[PDB]
Design a protein around this ligand. Structure first.
Ligand code: MG
Ligand code: ZN
Ligand code: ZN
Ligand code: ZN
Lengths: 112, 171, 554, 107, 270, 87, 177, 97
DNA sequence: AGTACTTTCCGGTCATT
RNA sequence: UUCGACCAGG
DNA sequence: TAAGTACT
């Protein structure tokens, strides 16, 4: 029900202006903010502390402070993070790259 | 000693050859870059067996150029000598420091002082050799060596072997 | 990218294993002793001394050599060097832990202060999360200050069980600058304050148990606590601390290249004291200096004021500083860079372009280029562009052959010549209908960046259609805009199939279209409506002719 | 279940987790004057069999951690009395599709 | 912040909303799997209106001279009146439209019946209309079975999730429910024949379209929803140029900060 | 790894091609075509690659395969041939 | 290069590279327990000369064959017969294979895929390790000593008499020339 | 001109995957380094001529990959190393999931 | 328990180093 | 390149 | 600017 409020509140903020946002969005955010357990704040105090990789959280408000304790605690990064790959110069698993493409030699013969 | 290990290799094929008989080209190239290869972890790659049932699997297209990359899984015949391994080959070159036996695709060398004493080295000979009381070792003479040590290098493998133990020498 | 073929297979990074350097590794890796603190001048003679930068490390002066690694400058990334310290030093950023760890283990024997025996501990040994064990463990043993030798097991509080030994009281600890000091309580009374020598700490750690590492947020292979203390120092190579030469007979050394210069100096001076007139503790007055530099070199925005200003009063860019958010590596160099194939000018409306179009000025279209690959389909057209030159509009300015070599179309004694080769690339001019990404910052919309159709036009302005105005959120009161040019056949596709303006017409942020009709067109589309309003032949005819898809039926 | 009035002694409560399997819970009167589950906002939850759970996971291909969570002390978590590991199914209404199925494991 | 906080969130091929850990954040993007883009404010006619009007509109009784479909509408009009095997489907329908009523009134208490929903049905028929030059004069040619049984066979295909099991195929029903309600609302026997004289042709068409059109309005596994939603909120946040509560911008800040001491605290007790 | 390869049956994902998919299939294909790869359709006089691809893609004569990874790592395999192309 | 069916998780400290000796301790890449492509396990594959001469020939041959389905669209006597099979299905610049067949074809000890068969069926009742079960097949041995000495990995694995019988049945199957 | 953070976020939204990379690499940084298949570092002494590769210390010469990454990144890394922190670059996942 | 401290997106000038 | 300032603009 | 932590 907390969620329900957190949403209701955020929604009212956008409504006061006479604007409109399709649920889903405010929902999504209001959710990301909740799932974890309670009220996880959209700030260096909250979300940017979760289990997410290092290189990611690394790019927002704590950087070095964060990287330091990453090697100290020998963290391992999945490189599933958008940011992760942006930093490596690789194609991020995002839309266009949320999947792979292959030449199926088989079908490559019936075509002639 | 000669083995039949299961290997695999990745070839990056350029869209160019994304033809009809691609399967063909791949295999072909597989061969270009293997039969004749050499590693310490595999030694001499000599021949790809079962040319026909070579697995190609689906290759995936890289992502900046159409080049595709298939993990060609094959099986072949290998040979990588070992220290303490006993093999017999044919001598090739022979000097004042010993002769070199050729056990297969490899060349094993034997030091003058890594043979017996009753075996000296005759210089003014033609072709050059090593004489004994009853034995005579030269070019074509077949020897059986005990590979004392192995040294990997570039695209080949050498090793020093002895004939000082028993049941070792000519035949 | 990089150029020159490498028989080295190529792959993508999949994982990033964060760790800490082990003094032994730092050594193995290094290719430079790094004994002298000077830069070069073999007695003014120009070159580099086997001392600092290039005692085998990277290079400068446009000269191959990188330990024969040749390649020279571009291609030879740096090759770390090291520099054996005199005495162990903290790691400016780790102190925090190093300290918080001691409060978790007692010296002399060096082992935990709470075994499976204490129950409140059990619960703190099940939590799987390095960050959380060590954040609960610590909270539990930061209080107890007596290395218990006998404790009441899972039975009677009467019966006492034994484990490790040496009750040697545990001193509480506090942080003063770059050192750790603690008091040992003596009963009978009054404290006993002494400075914990690194040399000491380091030791207590080396002995910490293997399972003890782990229990506390660490890793036997990648990060043993004992490494938070610097024994050997890795020496970033030129490319990390490059120079800046004003031709010759001058200087240009980088900030970093100095702190090492100091660290190095302040190291030697120490050494030359432990093998000479060593007034015992008139040294720890010069060992704090190394702990200082080798600290600041990494971080220089501490609480203990002394900024370590460099002669002139300029703060000194610490490594940390280089990564610090915004304007910095991570956020300014990696998460967002400057790029090529881009242009920006002033935008102005033009009621004559289809919505999805964008007016690009010849000036630019002749500057920006798209690499096309010589194919039998184009050969002809391409060769014509090449001949045309890089001055006439529909043309090109660079032909590049398989042989990884660029023909500069504006100079080449063969400009006019050249027969293309299927497989060659011909960077040509941006042509009418090359998809591009147009945009107006601040970008806070999918729409702040859309793909348009290039339409080469005269005069100097990006001329965008009016209705696509409100999505970028732009006026023409002098507003500027950015244009990026795709580069690979598959890149374009991504713009044209997902970023094209016609697509952005209906927006998800509000499940309603996001572009409409404004100003004249709107205002006028009301007037032109009204019952009151009629139009006569002569004109109704032209109006028809204007709608391009008029079925020709008055 | 033990219902206290103004409070229990810290000497007392430290005797609940000393006789497993069995379990005990502490509730204040003033907190049970009203049932929270009856609140407009709070949607109805539901416990899940260690069968229904080992399923949920298998059908989404989830590991225990990737699942949304509920506090061990959460008002509703108590009303139903979950246990570190039990999963609750939250079914609420939705302005996008009548009903929505959500899951909350427990920490 | 809003962004950095949701980058990693996208819809994975299973139609779940997760991040880089794979921690489910939404089991079906937006609790319905529909892409924001394909949605319009439609009206769930079944909600508002007097209990009286409701009957006059959706109720069909084949056992009554005044509550049956006048044979001026359906071709097989006269030969139906009374049939008892039909008045079972004809009543199954109604009992449902009624379940519907009560359901919506339990979700949208306000009474507001206009909501965002994929597939604009209003128009889809409007086209059906002037596409088949349908004359409001002569009688249809739909069996009563034709209608009711096809509408039921429609909901069967509005697939959002696909899975080959209960848990999954159960969610299916869920993330569609609302829509169907709107579907049954506009494809109820009386309506289908009295309000929009559809022919067998038109109807079979109107159905086909709804199916296809729906299947398009699903969300694409690939959509980086997070970033999207982020902006979608933080965008109309900049356009905020400024009864005595805390207000907009500062408040939103207050909210994302999860601050303990809010300027305005209030609390409405009914 | 094959435990991570889902059978052609038991298949679950969308029977239709995602907009990103096609977008990439076309791009990708275009690229290759522009690389002098072999074209499997009569170029009705077409000469622009992404154009050709758009054709190959409508005669569903593209030798590619979209491998859809799942959150847990297991993937599903589909062919441009199978995949329905609405849009 | 060319990977080998077994991703050994190398966690940084690569230091234990044991020695190589007829202590049957072959590089990790040749444990008795290696992995087959099908994902199954399988005993190492030990080829004794002349048994190898046949595997190679058998494929170098059936290659020439499938090299023509697609084409449409006595000691000194075998030196010549093989040289051709190469100059048809080999790389020609595989000077190793050339030399591998000479050697392999000269020191070979059997000509029939039947003889080589029995050799195998025989030694394969020993319970011996593949590498020995090779040397025994490609090295002339008259005594248990000449044997248990040029293959010191045998020493305690088989009575002298037994090993001696086997050696008898070898020179007995040893095809002439 | 600059393709700052915001501009990225947009492409990410668009799902314009490849494009994003293209701005980030090909049209900017893009660099090619070598690694030790063992100790995920830049150590590698690539002579890219006599094909020699080495990496004494982890002592290789056989297991070596080549990767493409934004030069800025290489730096990020080298800067991190000078701070005595190790960022490992591995070409294969071993943690599954 | 209080007070201070630290932590919007995007050309050319001058001055110093 | 950098620090600083200023500016200048959307 | 204004808020939030961590710190003295
Ligand atoms: Mg303005
Ligand atoms: Zn170099
Ligand atoms: Zn102790
Ligand atoms: Zn290495």
């Amino acid at each position: 029900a907390g969620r329900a409020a957190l949403y209701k509140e955020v929604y009212n903020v956008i409504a006061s202006d006479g604007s409109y946002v399709n649920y889903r969005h405010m929902a999504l955010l209001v959710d990301v903010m909740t799932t974890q357990g309670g009220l996880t704040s959209v700030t260096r105090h909250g979300f940017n502390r979760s289990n997410t990789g290092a290189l990611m959280r690394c790019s927002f408000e704590e950087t070095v402070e964060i990287l330091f304790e990453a090697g100290a605690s020998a963290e391992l990064d999945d490189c599933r993070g958008v940011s992760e790959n942006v930093i490596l110069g690789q194609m991020a698993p995002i839309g266009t790259g949320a999947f792979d493409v292959m030449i199926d030699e088989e079908s490559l013969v019936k075509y002639m | 000693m000669f083995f039949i290990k299961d290997l695999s290799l990745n070839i990056t094929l350029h869209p160019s050859f994304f033809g009809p008989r691609m399967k063909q080209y791949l295999k072909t190239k597989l061969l270009e870059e293997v039969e004749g290869s050499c590693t310490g972890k595999f030694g001499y790659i000599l021949c790809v067996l079962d040319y026909d049932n070579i697995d190609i699997q689906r290759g995936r297209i890289l992502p900046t150029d159409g080049s595709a990359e298939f993990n060609v899984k094959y099986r072949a015949v290998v040979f990588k000598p070992f220290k303490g391994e006993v093999v017999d080959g044919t001598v090739v070159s022979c000097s004042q420091h010993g002769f070199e036996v050729q056990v297969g695709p490899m060349k094993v060398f034997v030091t003058k002082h890594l043979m017996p004493q009753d075996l000296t080295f005759n210089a003014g000979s033609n072709p050059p050799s090593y004489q004994s009381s009853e034995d005579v070792i030269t070019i074509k003479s077949r020897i059986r060596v005990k590979i004392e040590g192995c040294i990997s290098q570039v695209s080949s493998i050498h090793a020093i072997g002895s004939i000082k133990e028993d049941y070792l020498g000519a035949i | 990218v990089g150029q020159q073929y490498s028989s080295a297979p190529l792959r993508t990074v999949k994982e990033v294993q964060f760790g800490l350097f082990s003094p032994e590794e730092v050594r193995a890796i290094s290719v430079a002793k790094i004994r002298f603190p000077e830069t070069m001048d073999e007695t003014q003679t120009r070159a580099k001394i086997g001392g600092l930068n290039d005692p085998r490390l990277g290079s400068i002066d446009r000269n191959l050599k990188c330990q024969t690694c040749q390649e020279g400058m571009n291609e030879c990334p740096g090759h770390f060097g090291h520099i054996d310290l005199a005495k162990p030093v903290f790691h400016v950023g780790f102190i925090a832990k190093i300290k918080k760890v001691c409060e978790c283990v007692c010296m002399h024997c060096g082992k935990l202060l709470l075994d499976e025996h204490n129950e409140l501990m059990r619960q703190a040994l099940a939590i799987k999360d390095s960050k959380k064990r060590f954040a609960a463990i610590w909270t539990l043993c930061k209080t107890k200050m007596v290395c218990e030798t006998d404790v009441p097991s899972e039975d009677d509080p009467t019966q006492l069980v034994s484990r490790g030994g040496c009750g040697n009281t545990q001193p509480t600890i506090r942080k003063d600058g770059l050192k750790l000091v603690g008091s040992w309580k003596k009963d009978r009374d009054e404290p006993e304050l002494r400075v914990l020598s690194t040399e000491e700490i380091l030791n207590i750690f080396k002995h910490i148990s293997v399972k003890d590492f782990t229990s506390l947020g660490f890793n036997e292979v990648f990060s043993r606590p004992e490494w938070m203390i610097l024994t050997c120092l890795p020496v970033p190579p030129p490319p990390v601390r490059p120079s800046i030469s004003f031709n010759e007979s001058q200087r240009g050394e980088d900030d970093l290249t100095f702190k090492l210069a100091d660290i190095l100096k302040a190291n030697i001076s120490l050494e030359t004291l432990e093998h000479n007139g060593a007034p015992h503790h008139a040294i720890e007055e010069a060992e704090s200096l190394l702990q200082f530099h080798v600290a600041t070199y990494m971080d220089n925005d501490i609480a203990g004021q002394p900024q370590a200003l460099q002669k002139s009063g300029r703060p000194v860019k610490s490594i940390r500083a280089r990564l610090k958010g915004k304007e910095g590596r991570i956020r300014g160099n990696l998460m967002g860079k400057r790029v090529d194939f881009s242009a920006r000018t002033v935008i102005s409306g033009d009621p004559n372009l289809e919505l999805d179009q964008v007016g690009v000025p010849k000036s630019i279209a002749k500057t920006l280029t798209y690499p096309e690959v010589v194919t039998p389909y184009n050969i002809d057209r391409l060769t014509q562009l090449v001949r045309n030159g890089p001055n006439e509009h529909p043309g090109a300015k660079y032909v590049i052959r398989d042989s990884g070599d660029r023909i500069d179309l504006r100079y080449s004694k063969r400009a006019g010549d050249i027969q293309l080769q299927y497989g060659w690339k011909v960077e040509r001019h941006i042509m009418d209908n090359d998809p591009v990404l147009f945009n107006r910052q601040p970008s806070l919309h999918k729409m702040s960046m859309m793909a348009h159709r290039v339409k080469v036009i005269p005069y100097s302005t990006f001329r965008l259609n009016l209705s696509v105005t409100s999505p970028y959120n732009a006026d023409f009161d002098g507003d500027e805009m950015n244009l990026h040019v795709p580069q690979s056949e598959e890149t374009r596709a991504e713009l044209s199939q997902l970023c094209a303006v016609p697509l952005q017409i209906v927006s998800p942020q509000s499940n309603k279209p996001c572009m409409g009709i404004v100003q004249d067109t709107l205002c006028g589309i009301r007037k032109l409506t009204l019952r009151d309003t009629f139009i006569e032949l002569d004109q109704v005819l032209n109006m028809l002719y204007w709608v391009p898809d008029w079925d020709g039926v008055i | 279940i033990f219902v206290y009035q103004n409070n229990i002694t810290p000497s007392a409560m430290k005797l609940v987790p000393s006789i497993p399997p069995a379990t005990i819970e502490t509730f204040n009167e003033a907190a049970l004057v009203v049932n929270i589950t009856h609140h407009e906002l709070v949607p109805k939850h539901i416990r899940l069999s260690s069968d229904e759970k080992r399923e949920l996971l298998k059908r989404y291909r989830l590991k225990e951690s990737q699942l949304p969570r509920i506090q061990r002390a959460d008002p509703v978590a108590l009303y139903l009395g979950l246990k570190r590991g039990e999963v609750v199914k939250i079914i609420r209404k939705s302005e996008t599709s009548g009903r929505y199925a959500s899951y909350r494991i427990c920490m | 912040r809003l962004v950095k906080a949701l980058e990693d969130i996208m819809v994975h091929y299973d139609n779940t909303t997760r991040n880089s850990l794979g921690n489910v954040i939404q089991f079906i993007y937006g609790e319905d799997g529909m892409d924001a883009a394909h949605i319009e404010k439609q009206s769930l006619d079944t909600i508002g209106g007097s209990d009286a009007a409701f009957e006059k509109r959706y109720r069909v009784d084949l056992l009554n001279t005044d509550h049956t479909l006048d044979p001026s509408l359906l071709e097989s009009g006269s030969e139906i009146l009374g049939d008892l095997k039909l008045q079972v489907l004809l009543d199954e329908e109604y009992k449902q439209l009624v379940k519907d009523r009560k359901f919506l009134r339990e979700v949208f208490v306000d009474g507001e019946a206009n909501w965002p929903l994929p597939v604009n049905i209003r128009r889809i028929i409007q086209n059906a209309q002037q596409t088949f030059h349908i004359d409001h004069t002569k009688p249809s040619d739909l069996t009563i079975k034709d209608i009711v049984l096809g509408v039921k066979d429609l909901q069967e295909n509005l697939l959002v999730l696909r899975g080959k099991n209960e848990i999954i195929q159960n969610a299916q029903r869920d993330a569609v429910t609302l829509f169907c309600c709107l579907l049954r609302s506009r494809l109820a026997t009386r309506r289908v024949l009295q309000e929009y004289r559809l022919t067998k042709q038109a109807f079979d068409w109107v159905l086909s379209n709804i199916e296809a059109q729906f299947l398009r309005s699903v969300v694409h596994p690939g959509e980086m929803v997070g970033v999207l939603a982020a902006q979608s909120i933080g965008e109309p946040a900049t356009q905020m140029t400024l009864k005595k509560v805390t207000s907009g911008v500062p408040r939103l800040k207050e909210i994302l900060n999860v601050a303990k001491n809010m300027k305005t605290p209030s609390l409405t007790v009914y | 790894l094959k435990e991570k390869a889902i059978p052609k049956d038991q298949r679950a994902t969308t029977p239709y091609m995602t907009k990103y998919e096609r977008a990439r299939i076309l791009g990708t294909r275009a690229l290759q075509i522009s690389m002098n790869a072999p074209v499997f359709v009569d170029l009705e006089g077409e000469t622009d690659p992404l154009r050709i691809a758009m054709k190959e893609l409508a005669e569903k004569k593209i030798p590619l395969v979209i491998r859809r990874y799942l959150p847990d790592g297991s993937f599903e395999d589909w062919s441009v041939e199978e995949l329905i192309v609405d849009l | 290069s060319t990977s080998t069916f077994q991703t050994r998780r190398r966690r940084l400290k690569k230091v234990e590279e044991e020695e190589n000796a007829a202590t049957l301790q072959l590089g990790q890449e040749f444990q008795l327990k290696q992995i087959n492509h099908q994902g199954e396990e399988e005993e190492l594959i030990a080829l004794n000369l002349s048994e190898a001469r046949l595997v190679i020939k058998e494929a170098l041959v059936e290659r020439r064959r499938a090299f023509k389905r697609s084409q449409k669209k006595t000691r000194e006597k075998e030196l010549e017969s093989i040289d051709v099979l190469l100059e048809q299905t080999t790389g020609g610049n595989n000077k190793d294979l050339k030399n591998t067949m000479q050697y392999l074809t000269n020191f070979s000890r059997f000509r029939d895929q039947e003889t080589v068969g029995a050799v195998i069926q025989l030694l394969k009742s020993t319970g011996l390790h593949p590498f020995e079960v090779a040397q025994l097949g490609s090295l002339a041995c008259d005594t248990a000593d000449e044997a248990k000495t040029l293959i010191p990995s045998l020493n305690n694995k088989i009575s002298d008499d037994e090993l001696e019988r086997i050696l008898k049945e070898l020179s007995n199957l040893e095809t002439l020339y | 001109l600059r393709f700052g953070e915001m501009e990225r976020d947009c492409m990410i939204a668009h799902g314009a995957a490849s494009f994003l990379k293209e701005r980030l690499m090909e049209a900017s940084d893009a660099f090619r380094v070598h690694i030790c298949g063992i100790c995920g570092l830049m150590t590698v002494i690539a002579k890219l001529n006599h094909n020699q590769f080495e990496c004494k210390g982890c002592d290789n010469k056989i297991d070596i990959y080549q990767i493409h990454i934004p030069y800025a990144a290489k730096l990020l890394f080298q800067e991190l190393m000078a701070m005595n922190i190790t960022p490992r670059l591995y070409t294969d996942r071993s943690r599954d999931f």
